[PDB]
Amino acid sequence: ELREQLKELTKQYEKSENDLKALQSVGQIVGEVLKQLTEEKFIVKATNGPRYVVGCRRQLDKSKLKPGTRVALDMTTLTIMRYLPREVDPLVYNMNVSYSEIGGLSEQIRELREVIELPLTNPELFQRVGIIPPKGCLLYGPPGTGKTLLARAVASQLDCNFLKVVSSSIVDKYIGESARLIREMFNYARDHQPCIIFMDEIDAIGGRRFSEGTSADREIQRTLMELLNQMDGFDTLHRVKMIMATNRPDTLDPADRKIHIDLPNEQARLDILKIHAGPITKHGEIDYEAIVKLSDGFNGADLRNVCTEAGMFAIRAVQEDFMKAVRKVADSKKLESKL
Amino acid sequence: CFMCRKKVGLTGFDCRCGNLFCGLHRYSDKHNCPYDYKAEAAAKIRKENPVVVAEKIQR
Amino acid sequence: GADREVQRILLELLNQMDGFDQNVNVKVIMATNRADTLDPALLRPGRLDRKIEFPLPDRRQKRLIFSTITSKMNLSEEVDLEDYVARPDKISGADINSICQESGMLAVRENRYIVLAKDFEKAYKTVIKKDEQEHEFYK
Amino acid sequence: DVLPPEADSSIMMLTSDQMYADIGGMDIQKQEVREAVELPLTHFELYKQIGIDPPRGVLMYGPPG
Amino acid sequence: KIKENSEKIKVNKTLPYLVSNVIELLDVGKCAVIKTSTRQTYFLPVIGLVDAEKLKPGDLVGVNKDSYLILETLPTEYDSRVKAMEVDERPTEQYSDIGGLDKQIQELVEAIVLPMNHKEKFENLGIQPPKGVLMYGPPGTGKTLLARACAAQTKATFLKLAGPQLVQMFIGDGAKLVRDAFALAKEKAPSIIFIDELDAIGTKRFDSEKAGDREVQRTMLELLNQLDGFQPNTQVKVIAATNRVDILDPALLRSGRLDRKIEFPMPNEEARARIMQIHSRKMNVSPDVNYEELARCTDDFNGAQCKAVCVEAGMIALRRGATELTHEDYMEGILQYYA
Ligand SMILES: Nc1ncnc2c1ncn2[C@@H]1O[C@H](COP(=O)(O)OP(=O)(O)OP(=O)(O)O)[C@@H](O)[C@H]1O
Numbered sequence: 001e002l003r004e005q006l007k008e009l010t011k012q013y014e015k016s017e018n019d020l021k022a023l024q025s026v027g028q029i030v031g032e033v034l035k036q037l038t039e040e041k042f043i044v045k046a047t048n049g050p051r052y053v054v055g056c057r058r059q060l061d062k063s064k065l066k067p068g069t070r071v072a073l074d075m076t077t078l079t080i081m082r083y084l085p086r087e088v089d090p091l092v093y094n095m096n097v098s099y100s101e102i103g104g105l106s107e108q109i110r111e112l113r114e115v116i117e118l119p120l121t122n123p124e125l126f127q128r129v130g131i132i133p134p135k136g137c138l139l140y141g142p143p144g145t146g147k148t149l150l151a152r153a154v155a156s157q158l159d160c161n162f163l164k165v166v167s168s169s170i171v172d173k174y175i176g177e178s179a180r181l182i183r184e185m186f187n188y189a190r191d192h193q194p195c196i197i198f199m200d201e202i203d204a205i206g207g208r209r210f211s212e213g214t215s216a217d218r219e220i221q222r223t224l225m226e227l228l229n230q231m232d233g234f235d236t237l238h239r240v241k242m243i244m245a246t247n248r249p250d251t252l253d254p255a256d257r258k259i260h261i262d263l264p265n266e267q268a269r270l271d272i273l274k275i276h277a278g279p280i281t282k283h284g285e286i287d288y289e290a291i292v293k294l295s296d297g298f299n300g301a302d303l304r305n306v307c308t309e310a311g312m313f314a315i316r317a318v319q320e321d322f323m324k325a326v327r328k329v330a331d332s333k334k335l336e337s338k339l
Numbered sequence: 340c341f342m343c344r345k346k347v348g349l350t351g352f353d354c355r356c357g358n359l360f361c362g363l364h365r366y367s368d369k370h371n372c373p374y375d376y377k378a379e380a381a382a383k384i385r386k387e388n389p390v391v392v393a394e395k396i397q398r
Numbered sequence: 399g400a401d402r403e404v405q406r407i408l409l410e411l412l413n414q415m416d417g418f419d420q421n422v423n424v425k426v427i428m429a430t431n432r433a434d435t436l437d438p439a440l441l442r443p444g445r446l447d448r449k450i451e452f453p454l455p456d457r458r459q460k461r462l463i464f465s466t467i468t469s470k471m472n473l474s475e476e477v478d479l480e481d482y483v484a485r486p487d488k489i490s491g492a493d494i495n496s497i498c499q500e501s502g503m504l505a506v507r508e509n510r511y512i513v514l515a516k517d518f519e520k521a522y523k524t525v526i527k528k529d530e531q532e533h534e535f536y537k
Numbered sequence: 538d539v540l541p542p543e544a545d546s547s548i549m550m551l552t553s554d555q556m557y558a559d560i561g562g563m564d565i566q567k568q569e570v571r572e573a574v575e576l577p578l579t580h581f582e583l584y585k586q587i588g589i590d591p592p593r594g595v596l597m598y599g600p601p602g
Numbered sequence: 603k604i605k606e607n608s609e610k611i612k613v614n615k616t617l618p619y620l621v622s623n624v625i626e627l628l629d630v631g632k633c634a635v636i637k638t639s640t641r642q643t644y645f646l647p648v649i650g651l652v653d654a655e656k657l658k659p660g661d662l663v664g665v666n667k668d669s670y671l672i673l674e675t676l677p678t679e680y681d682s683r684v685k686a687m688e689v690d691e692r693p694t695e696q697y698s699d700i701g702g703l704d705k706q707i708q709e710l711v712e713a714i715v716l717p718m719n720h721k722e723k724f725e726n727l728g729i730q731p732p733k734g735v736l737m738y739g740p741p742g743t744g745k746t747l748l749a750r751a752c753a754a755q756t757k758a759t760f761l762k763l764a765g766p767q768l769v770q771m772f773i774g775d776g777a778k779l780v781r782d783a784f785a786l787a788k789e790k791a792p793s794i795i796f797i798d799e800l801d802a803i804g805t806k807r808f809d810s811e812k813a814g815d816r817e818v819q820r821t822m823l824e825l826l827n828q829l830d831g832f833q834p835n836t837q838v839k840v841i842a843a844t845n846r847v848d849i850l851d852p853a854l855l856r857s858g859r860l861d862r863k864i865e866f867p868m869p870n871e872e873a874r875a876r877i878m879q880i881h882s883r884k885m886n887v888s889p890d891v892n893y894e895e896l897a898r899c900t901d902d903f904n905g906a907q908c909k910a911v912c913v914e915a916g917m918i919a920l921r922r923g924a925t926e927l928t929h930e931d932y933m934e935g936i937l938q939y940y941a
């Protein structure tokens with residue numbers, strides 16, 4: 001076992017030596033330069049708060065770094081060691097799948113696609129130069145029409161960067177930073193030009209321009225105002241696309257491309273129930289005619305309820321029981337009666 | 340799986356006699372559940388009972 | 399509370415834009431859209447601020463805005479903008495731009511090469527109006 | 538040392554933007570803003586002569602959109 | 603000497619490995635962008651004693667306060683005492699002793715346990731288990747009873763509702779409690795979330811009374827997000843409890859969020875008899891009882907009043923040290939002109 005023992009010892013030696021070498025490299029301080037002061041002098045505001053003036057190691061191509069660029073100054077002398085790209089800390093989070101597996105929503109999916117995905121495609125303007133295609137879309141929707149699943153489908157379809165963000169971004173440290181998080185979002189997008197930002201539940205932050213309401217109202221309206229400023233204004237975009245989904249009471253955000261999403265469905269209700277019947281065949285008659293005849297609401301979870309309870313039935317005793325599926329249809333409709 | 344109805348329902352309520360009684364016959368009064376409900380009450384209440392010691396004895 | 403901080407910065411801004419005296423080459427501009435909910439203290443009517451409106455356009459302004467927005471657009475001989483503007487409505491500039499954009503979006507949907515009066519009319523519908531509930535009894 | 542005047546976070550490159558001739562109409566606002574902030578910054582003598590001091594601040598207040 | 607390397611690595615890794623975030627990762631080999639309690643931002647070209655891949659933007663890791671090298675990582679942390687409140691000493695009761703209520707327990711036990719244990723049936727049927735559950739305790743009768751009895755399964759954890767309204771006046775936050783709660787549920791094995799007194803949250807969402815309202819609406823919307831967003835949320839089971847049945851959020855309502863809204867009705871005569879029997883099981887009752895006729899006397903005695911009456915009867919008999927039921931001093935414990 002000479003060779004094997006030697007190999008294992010050598011692997012241990014390698015890893016141990018690498019770890020020791022690793023242990024002997026202090027970190028830097030991250031800070032963004034502010035001015036090219038002369039040549040070997042720069043004013044850098046270290047993130048911790050103090051602002052310093054320091055010189056840079058030669059092998060840094062001073063042309064590279066510029067007002068706003070981040071750099072890693074050294075512990076002791078604080079000379080600029082290495083410039084770094086932009087920084088975005090709490091957003092790897094913001095960056096399943098579905099492909100038109102929802103049913104219905106034909107005209108509205110066509111509109112959404114032609115507004116948000118097609119323009120980004122190779123047919124960029126093709127004489128369409130006159131449009132400056134829409135940068136934002138809205139999703140009027142009652143509670144479950146198919147908004148979030150639509151978002152899932154478009155996210156899995158387009159295949160570019162996606163940032164699904166929610167009105168639960170509000171934070172407080174004896175001051176406001178919601179606008180700061182918003183500008184972080186927008187900067188991230190602008191750097192990653194091809195991207196789909198998706199505000200959802202814009203009702204909360206959208207609120208209204210209430211005056212003399214309270215410190216909370218002022219802060220919330222300030223957050224809204226950051227959104228407005230970075231949607232419109234000097235932050236004009238070219239290759240990002242925005243999505244919104246909530247009810248009507250949203251301050252004032254006209255221009256774009258608002259789409260109504262209707263809770264009831266004509267025969268794509270039949271569709272949706274077939275997709276939700278995708279689960280294993282019932283061992284016989286597959287016609288949905290029973291539930292087809294009467295149907296209201298928006299959910300397919302009735303399918304899950306019937307299937308589970310009918311499996312329980314069968315264990316007590318397949319599920320060739322659309323006569324039984326009408327049972328859970330009536331169940332969901334009595335839930336409707338409740339509200 | 341209690342003798343009346345010979346029930347096997349997954350909902351079957353499993354009692355201190357480990358027996359998924361009939362939905363209508365799940366009660367000790369009904370099935371002579373041989374358990375010491377009162378003795379367990381006495382033990383638990385003795386354990387949990389607060390007693391005021393008047394806080395006068397001291398080292 | 400933090401109202402202290404915000405008011406503090408407000409008065410600092412007031413004092414500083416006052417420190418910008420006259421005979422100066424620093425000109426301050428600010429937006430507020432709606433105004434009524436603003437501080438006369440901030441306005442400092444004595445100086446530091448002159449006020450200007452920015453309302454919705456008149457009919458001639460609508461004509462000019464349509465002409466400007468549509469000149470870049472590949473229109474057609476069947477455009478009829480001189481009557482589209484003449485139509486009575488409360489359209490704003492953002493609404494005109496949305497009209498043109500959505501008309502182009504349709505045009506593209508049906509693969510048009512030059513926008514048409516039909517696309518402008520459809521955009522008019524899809525972007526303007528939608529307002530009802532002025533029930534005839536309600537009025 | 539006393540650093541050069543500048544040494545702070547702000548925007549001076551102008552980031553480019555889009556020369557006028559494209560807003561469309563709005564002649565009144567155009568003239569007012571141009572006078573107040575744009576040329577001719579020379580007419581300060583006319584201001585002081587008339588006794589009307591140089592306006593500063595516009596507030597550009599109007600309906601959104 | 604690999605061992606010696608290990609021991610000296612250990613000793614130079616003394617102990618007080620000041621903990622720091624892992625805010626960002628990069629590469630040029632990989633690096634780190636850690637951030638520290640003392641607001642600071644250290645780039646580390648050598649991350650340290652970590653694989654540099656299991657890390658992910660957002661994480662807590664020990665660090666040498668001077669070297670700023672990421673030392674042994676620590677399991678994620680949960681704030682607002684969500685972890686502390688999310689404890690349970692296996693509630694002692696083992697049986698489902700409630701009373702006449704049978705259909706409610708049936709559906710709840712099915713929809714909860716059967717997915718947990720006999721998920722084989724669900725997978726064979728190709729059915730995702732039943733959706734989030736609500737449990738109307740309009741009077742509260744049996745509400746906590748069913749909750750606690752359900753707290754007798756093989757093994758799981760139950761996230762109680764306890765002050766999700768713990769939000770600061772200065773805007774507060776969108777239920778960071780909710781964020782951490784759902785994070786903990788997601789990370790741990792199959793888990794359940796008992797939203798007690800859900801009525802404390804939830805509303806039409808349009809009323810514009812004043813502040814605090816809007817905070818409750820952000821918390822509500824955070825709840826909605828946590829189960830309706832771009833997340834399967836497969837390994838979760840929400841069970842809600844409310845008494846103000848009518849006034850609740852139309853979106854929180856159901857159909858992907860709170861389905862199978864079990865209802866607690868007023869116990870009938872039989873149900874009252876069963877509950878009083880259950881509470882009397884341990885009572886030193888003499889061999890003579892009119893349980894059924896006492897249930898008849900109940901006359902809308904729905905809630906815990908039965909338990910309170912059994913206790914009051916115990917005290918009543920204890921006046922004299924007895925073990926028998928008078929059956930009428932029992933009514934007076936229950937609780938001129940014509941007649
Ligand atoms: N049109 C639909 N077709 C198929 N499944 C749907 C549809 N609408 C909702 N669902 C089902 O409901 C869940 C997703 O709900 P949905 O995306 O409609 O919510 P939402 O409209 O964003 O809700 P809310 O408005 O209440 O926030 C998934 O179970 C999805 O299967």
Ligand SMILES: Nc1ncnc2c1ncn2[C@@H]1O[C@H](COP(=O)(O)OP(=O)(O)OP(=O)(O)O)[C@@H](O)[C@H]1O
Binds near residue numbers: 743744844
């Ligand atoms: N059916 C029942 N079986 C056993 N105990 C019951 C029953 N109904 C009420 N109780 C008693 O009620 C108390 C528990 O409260 P319960 O679960 O009924 O909720 P509640 O406080 O009435 O709820 P809510 O917050 O809606 O008012 C315990 O004393 C329990 O003994």
